[PDB]
Amino acid sequence: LSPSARRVQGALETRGFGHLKVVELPASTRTAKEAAQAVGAEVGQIVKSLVFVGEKGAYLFLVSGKNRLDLGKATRLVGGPLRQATPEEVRELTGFAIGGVPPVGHNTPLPAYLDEDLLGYPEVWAAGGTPRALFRATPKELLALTGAQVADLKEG
Numbered sequence: 001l002s003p004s005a006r007r008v009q010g011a012l013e014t015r016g017f018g019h020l021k022v023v024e025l026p027a028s029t030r031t032a033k034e035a036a037q038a039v040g041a042e043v044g045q046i047v048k049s050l051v052f053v054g055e056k057g058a059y060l061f062l063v064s065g066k067n068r069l070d071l072g073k074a075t076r077l078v079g080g081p082l083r084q085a086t087p088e089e090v091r092e093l094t095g096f097a098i099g100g101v102p103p104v105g106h107n108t109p110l111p112a113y114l115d116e117d118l119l120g121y122p123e124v125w126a127a128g129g130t131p132r133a134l135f136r137a138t139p140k141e142l143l144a145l146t147g148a149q150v151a152d153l154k155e156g
């Protein structure tokens with residue numbers, strides 16, 4: 001596993017979820033669409049870790065591959081103005097580059113929100129730190145791993 005992918009594996013291990021495995025695939029997983037095709041999953045099963053900057057800090061939004069994050073909803077949930085983090089901010093905050101941003105192992109653990117639609121799948125796939133890394137897990141484990149709060153995040 002490449003460094004960033006290893007960093008994520010390490011985080012899964014340190015959390016007590018060592019049985020979850022990061023895989024650096026022979027096919028791209030840069031976008032939810034590609035990720036789903038790479039593992040034969042439904043796009044909705046892909047977890048997009050989206051980082052947004054607020055006035056007093058950063059926030060992690062775990063969105064289903066089939067939904068579009070509603071900034072209006074996110075803003076209300078946090079209770080303050082929010083904005084999509086620039087590629088640069090993603091790197092400084094999380095330590096990973098967009099297209100590979102994982103839900104764990106960041107430079108600072110960010111308060112998180114989980115797209116309630118992810119609770120509809122028995123298993124989901126999140127990014128493992130690179131545009132080729134992914135690790136499968138149950139929504140429950142993703143919740144335990146991030147301590148995120150379930151929420152209505154989609155524009156739809």
Ligand SMILES: C[C@H](N)C(=O)NS(=O)(=O)OC[C@H]1O[C@@H](n2cnc3c(N)ncnc32)[C@H](O)[C@@H]1O
Nearest residue numbers: 029030031032048049085086087099100101127
């Ligand atoms: C799972 C897959 N590896 C992945 O990383 N999916 S992702 O949705 O989290 O990554 C793509 C998302 O990053 C964000 N993004 C893409 N380009 C961006 C840019 N130029 N600036 C800020 N955010 C961007 C958008 O939400 C885009 O949908």
